[PDB]
Design an enzyme around this catalytic site. Structure first.
Site, PDB file in Angstrom:
ATOM      1  N   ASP B  55       0.843  -1.188   0.000  1.00 22.92           N
ATOM      2  CA  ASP B  55       0.000   0.000   0.000  1.00 22.92           C
ATOM      3  C   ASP B  55       0.882   1.243   0.000  1.00 22.92           C
ATOM      4  O   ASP B  55       1.745   1.398   0.870  1.00 22.92           O
ATOM      5  CB  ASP B  55      -0.928  -0.009   1.214  1.00 22.92           C
ATOM      6  N   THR B  88      -5.031   4.808  -2.302  1.00 28.74           N
ATOM      7  CA  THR B  88      -3.925   5.692  -1.945  1.00 28.74           C
ATOM      8  C   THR B  88      -2.773   5.563  -2.933  1.00 28.74           C
ATOM      9  O   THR B  88      -2.101   6.553  -3.246  1.00 28.74           O
ATOM     10  CB  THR B  88      -3.446   5.388  -0.525  1.00 28.74           C
ATOM     11  N   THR B  89      -2.526   4.350  -3.432  1.00 26.82           N
ATOM     12  CA  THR B  89      -1.447   4.153  -4.393  1.00 26.82           C
ATOM     13  C   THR B  89      -1.800   4.758  -5.748  1.00 26.82           C
ATOM     14  O   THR B  89      -0.928   5.291  -6.444  1.00 26.82           O
ATOM     15  CB  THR B  89      -1.137   2.661  -4.531  1.00 26.82           C
ATOM     16  N   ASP B 386      -8.751  -1.509   4.251  1.00 25.43           N
ATOM     17  CA  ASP B 386      -8.960  -1.129   2.859  1.00 25.43           C
ATOM     18  C   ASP B 386     -10.169  -1.832   2.257  1.00 25.43           C
ATOM     19  O   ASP B 386     -10.847  -1.260   1.395  1.00 25.43           O
ATOM     20  CB  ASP B 386      -7.709  -1.439   2.036  1.00 25.43           C
TER      21      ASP B 386
END
Lengths: 550, 520, 48
Positions: B55, B88-89, B386
């Site tokens: 992540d 987020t990535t 997540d």
């Protein structure tokens, strides 16, 4: 521009650092002036770009305001602190023209220093600036334009977009225009027996990073940033006429006054004395709960001892908050702020007049932060703005971007007369001072003529940051303004020009009235007066004396 | 010298080039962290621990990057996590490519940044409409539809092998916290982990898992219907705010002082026995004297409890926290507790509180996890946060966006069509946005080992004619449609990726000069 | 007898003479006391 330093004379001795005299001081004053001036030249105008500063701890600051940039720069030069404190004085009083007053005062020092070498005396140079400034103010009163035949709030909407330019909110200035105008009109109050004034910072600025900046919601009421004491309390209050209690009295276990020493000769008294310590606090909270207060605000933290009765009575508890924030809550809802609970009689009592009134009190969670949204106030209206951005550093810039927009609109409603912006006044003051001093002439004509060209630094700097041709735009500003100064007020035409120019976006000369760019007359005045005192103080200094610290 | 300033001042076009190159290096490290075949990144903290995850949020958080512009990319990680928690990535890779792909100019064209910013604002508005048109709503009451939706974030993680078991844990955790709109929060979700065990044996159990054994051997460890009462005050003798300072004239007064301390605590124990609670929980420490009178009446004593656990216990059993013992009533006593048991594990004891499961306050539950080590537990916990965050977007936003890189490529096709119709001076910044949107689906090909030239060429051609659901397959690296691919992603995740990346790019374009080490 | 009070900010033109005693100190306002009193008698407290 100073080489070889200076030869230390043994016949002249003083404790501390050496004494430098002559033209070297005025050369170092301009050198120190151009150091802080070149920083704000690139940040001026919608085509301008701000700068970044590292705090050595890894955190930085991104802001377009020239006051914050100069505030973060600690200048060791004695005359350099004047321009630094000039920016802190500009945004504190007027709130606008912070970058311009630094650049104007910098050009006044660069041109006057070149005049000192011309052998004209500095006091004659200062006299030329003050006489030209007295007539320049009279010209500002002639170009004033009172708002007339305008539809709705468009007058304040177009002026607010000018301060939003050059900053990150300039692209979103179309959406943010209605939020700023409606923010200062809701906090409208009355003082001085009929005079209308507005509070500063009264609009709360909350920082929640997420979604987009165009989706920022305008709350019709005040918003307070705090966390609930007990998570078992309801976060939403249903029904109208919500009672808010603004109190400075914390509910906690408290020690008796230090001037008291308890001495007991019986063990049986330990049960009643220890129980009464918590029982004294119960008498104050009991009368408040019976009044039906839904929300109780408190300036100081509240221990879990008194938070039990708030859960059973379905009362929302509050803990430490800013003292200045609780004042506008009671005034908006009708509550009276109580520093210490007491009555005229020697007996404790609680009156229902100390409770506020509003439509509802809700707690909304923005990202991982939770804040209270108070909407539909009773006594006085309020407002709040929640700024949204990609990161917290962009929110720090939007705060100063929003604070500068509130100061421009605040000065707009105080004086109905406004002047066109975008380098229109600086180009108009040039030609007005060119024909000036031609009657008197003599020696003072040269010092006044340089003061007219000193104001040309503002319109010329705007064209440099746009990667366009400056000489093409400056020649046009001098073409329309020059021939129209002699116009007689009939047969029209004529003065219909000279009222507009210097559009950085399209690089063409367009009407500022149809464009919408305007500036209050308060921002123009007192800006040259403060820049003059900064120029007079530095120019009068022949010799700088530095004493070594002990 | 003057003030704090100068040293090496970076001015001109090289100041913006240094901001583009430094921000581009942020997305190059996690460039391999996108996709189902994404690798892992091991981080070394100064505290001596270890962080191994794919992540981009946890990777960019612990890494210390010293640079004015490059730190702004680090702050974008918490923007996607705190608002949503998924993608987020994708945001860092997208925002890193936008700055390079959308603004290579001013090195060549010498275009002013604000002119580019004005085009990015119009490109962001049109990009949202394209996502809304390609988004097909999905029913939130279908259990079979939510299982395949949670597996979206699972497909890129290590728990994809357990994805059949993992969707059972994430669905029951979000549905329990959901309160009837349908606002939930992860502060009540417990991250507590069990070292060792089998992942298949891990299950979400209602109630709060306590690590503390019973205080006294005669305390019953098996109760059919436990009754829980929470006490914030300690059972010990309160000294008081002010000193007592008893002056003892006669020898009989000192023995009464120590005798009342036994009777004063006994007085607080008799008021507790009025509601005859089976389990008494105290936030602070407890004296060994108070446990005897509570054991005689059937009450159970426990170790001091943190404030965070007191809020979760009150939600499960419906109990109300009661600080004052004299004000304790039967209405605030917790009921409907399924089972109370204690199981032996070598590390620590564990106390179980089961809910009778049968509107009111939202229920609380804990997630038990059996891993292979201590670090594997922290990896699955980040995978659950997540995966469970995906179910929060579909409930608040029933709209469902295309996944597998189909959202970013669908926008790139629409921007290229309107680029020629717009013309003007803004055509270059507007068309350059479509080039930065196709980099995310291009990463899926580089990680799969395919040819991005031939695959992306047929992807754009089949996108207009075939359908808007066409995307890149992660495992096979082929051209497939998201309708038959069976996996979708919420629109909130795609909206946060487009908005945050564009709004952050406008901040770095406005930078003129950089001065370091001014002062503290 | 002449008392010259200094206040940061402003301009030199704003300097003017007052027809009465100017109080350099400022009020409390922590309890929300009135800052303007018309036709009031000013007292002096040497005690506490």
């Amino acid at each position: 521009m100073s080489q070889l330093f200076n030869n230390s004379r043994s016949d002249t001795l003083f404790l501390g650092g050496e004494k430098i005299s002559g033209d070297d001081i005025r050369n170092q004053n301009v050198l120190a002036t151009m150091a802080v001036a070149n920083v704000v030249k690139s940040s001026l105008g919608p085509v301008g770009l701000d700068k970044m500063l590292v705090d050595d701890i890894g955190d930085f600051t991104v802001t377009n305001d020239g006051a914050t940039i100069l505030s973060l720069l600690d200048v060791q030069h004695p005359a350099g602190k004047i321009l630094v404190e000039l920016a802190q004085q500009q945004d504190r009083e007027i709130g606008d023209g912070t970058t311009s007053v630094v650049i104007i005062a910098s050009e006044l020092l660069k041109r006057a220093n070149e005049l000192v070498k011309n052998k004209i005396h500095p006091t004659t140079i200062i006299t030329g600036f003050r006489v030209a400034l007295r007539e320049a103010i009279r010209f500002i009163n002639e170009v004033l334009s009172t708002s007339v035949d305008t539809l709705g709030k468009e007058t304040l909407i177009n002026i607010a977009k000018t301060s939003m330019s050059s900053k990150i909110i300039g692209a979103d200035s179309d959406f943010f225009s209605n939020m700023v105008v409606d923010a200062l009109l809701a906090v409208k109050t009355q003082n001085s027996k009929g005079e209308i004034k507005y509070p500063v910072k009264a609009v709360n600025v909350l920082k929640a990073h997420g979604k987009s900046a165009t989706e920022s919601l305008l709350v019709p009421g005040y918003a307070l940033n705090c966390t609930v004491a007990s998570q078992a309390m309801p976060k939403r209050i249903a029904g109208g006429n919500v009672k808010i209690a603004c109190l400075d009295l914390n509910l906690q276990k408290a020690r008796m006054a230090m001037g008291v020493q308890i001495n007991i000769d019986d063990p049986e008294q330990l049960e009643q004395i220890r129980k009464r310590e918590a029982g004294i606090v119960l008498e104050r909270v009991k009368k408040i709960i019976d009044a039906g207060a839904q929300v109780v605000l408190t300036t100081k933290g509240i221990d879990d001892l008194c938070l039990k009765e708030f859960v059973e009575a379905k009362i929302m508890g509050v803990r430490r908050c800013k003292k200045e924030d609780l004042r506008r809550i009671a005034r908006a809802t009708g509550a009276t702020l109580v520093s210490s609970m007491s009555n005229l009689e020697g007996e404790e009592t609680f009156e229902s007049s100390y409770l506020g009134l509003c439509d509802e009190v809700v707690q909304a969670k923005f990202s991982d932060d939770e804040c209270i949204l108070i909407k539909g106030t009773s006594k006085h209206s309020s407002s709040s703005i929640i700024l949204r951005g990609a990161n917290d550093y962009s929110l720090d810039e939007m705060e100063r971007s929003l604070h500068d927009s509130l100061s421009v609109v605040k000065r707009t409603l105080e004086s109905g007369n406004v002047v066109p912006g975008g380098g229109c006044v600086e180009a108009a003051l040039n030609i007005y001072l060119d024909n000036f001093a031609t009657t008197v002439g003599s020696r003072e004509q040269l010092a006044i003529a340089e003061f007219a060209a000193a104001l040309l630094i503002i319109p010329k700097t705007l064209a440099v940051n746009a990667a366009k041709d400056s000489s093409e735009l400056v020649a046009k500003l001098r073409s329309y303004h020059a021939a129209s100064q002699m116009a007689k007020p009939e047969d029209v035409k004529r003065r219909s020009y000279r009222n507009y120019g210097l559009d950085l976006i399209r690089g063409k000369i367009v009407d500022e009235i149809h464009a919408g760019v305007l500036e209050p007359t308060i921002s123009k005045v007192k800006s040259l007066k403060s820049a003059l005192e900064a120029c007079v103080a530095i120019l009068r200094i022949d010799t700088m004396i530095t004493v070594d610290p002990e | 010298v003057f003030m704090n300033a100068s040293q090496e001042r970076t001015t001109g076009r090289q100041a913006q080039i240094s901001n583009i190159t430094a921000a581009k290096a942020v997305a190059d490290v996690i460039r391999t962290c996108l996709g189902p075949k994404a690798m892992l990144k091991m981080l070394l903290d100064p505290m001596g621990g270890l962080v191994l995850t794919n992540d981009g949020h946890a990777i960019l958080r612990e890494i210390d990057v010293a640079h004015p512009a490059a730190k702004s990319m680090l702050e974008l990680s918490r923007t996607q996590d705190e608002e949503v928690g998924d993608g987020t990535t994708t945001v860092i890779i997208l925002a890193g490519e936008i700055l390079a792909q959308c603004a290579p100019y001013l090195i060549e064209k010498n275009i002013h940044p604000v002119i580019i910013i004005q085009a990015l604002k119009k490109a962001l508005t049109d990009a949202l409409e394209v996502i809304k048109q390609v988004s097909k709503p999905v029913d939130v009451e279908n259990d079979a539809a939510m299982k395949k939706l949670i597996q979206a974030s699972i497909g890129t993680k290590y728990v994809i092998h357990w994805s059949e078991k993992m969707c059972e844990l994430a669905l029951d955790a979000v549905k329990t916290v959901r309160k009837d709109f349908e606002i939930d929060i992860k502060r009540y979700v417990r991250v507590e982990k069990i070292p060792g065990g089998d992942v298949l044996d891990s299950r979400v159990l209602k109630g709060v898992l306590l690590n503390k054994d019973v205080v006294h051997p005669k305390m019953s460890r098996h109760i059919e219907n436990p009754r829980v009462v929470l006490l914030d005050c300690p059972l010990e003798y309160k000294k008081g705010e002010s000193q007592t300072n008893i002056e003892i004239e006669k020898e009989e007064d000192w023995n009464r002082i120590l005798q009342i301390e036994e009777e004063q605590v006994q007085l607080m124990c008799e008021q507790i026995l009025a509601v005859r609670p089976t389990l008494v929980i105290t936030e602070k420490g407890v004296s060994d004297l108070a446990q005897h009178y509570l054991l005689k009446g059937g009450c159970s004593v426990l170790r001091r409890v943190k404030k965070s656990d007191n809020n979760r216990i009150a939600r499960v059993t419906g109990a109300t926290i009661v600080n004052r013992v004299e004000d304790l009533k039967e209405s605030d006593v917790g009921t409907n507790c399924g089972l109370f048991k204690v199981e032996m594990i070598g590390d620590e004891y564990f106390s179980f509180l089961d809910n009778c499961k049968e509107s009111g306050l939202q229920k609380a539950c804990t997630i038990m996890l059996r891993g292979g080590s201590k670090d594997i537990l922290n990896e699955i916990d980040r995978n659950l946060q997540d995966a469970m965050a995906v179910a929060r977007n579909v409930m608040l936003s029933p709209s469902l966006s295309p996944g597998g890189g189909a959202t970013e490529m669908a926008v790139s096709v629409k921007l290229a069509e309107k680029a020629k119709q717009l013309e003007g001076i803004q055509q270059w910044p507007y068309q350059a946005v479509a080039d930065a949107m196709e980099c995310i689906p291009r990463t899926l090909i580089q990680n799969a080992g395919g040819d991005p030239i031939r695959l992306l060429s047929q992807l754009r051609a089949k996108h207009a004619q075939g359908n808007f659901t066409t995307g890149i397959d992660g495992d096979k690296g082929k051209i497939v449609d998201m309708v038959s691919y069976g996996i979708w992603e919420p629109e909130v995740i795609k909206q946060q990726s487009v908005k945050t990346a564009i709004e952050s790019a406008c901040l770095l374009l406005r930078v003129d000069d950089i001065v370091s080490g001014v002062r503290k | 007898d002449i008392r010259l009070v200094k206040k940061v900010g402003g301009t030199i033109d704003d300097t003017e003479m007052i027809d009465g005693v100017v109080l350099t100190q400022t009020a409390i306002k922590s309890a929300g006391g009135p800052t303007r009193k018309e036709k009031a008698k000013i007292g002096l407290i040497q005690f506490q």
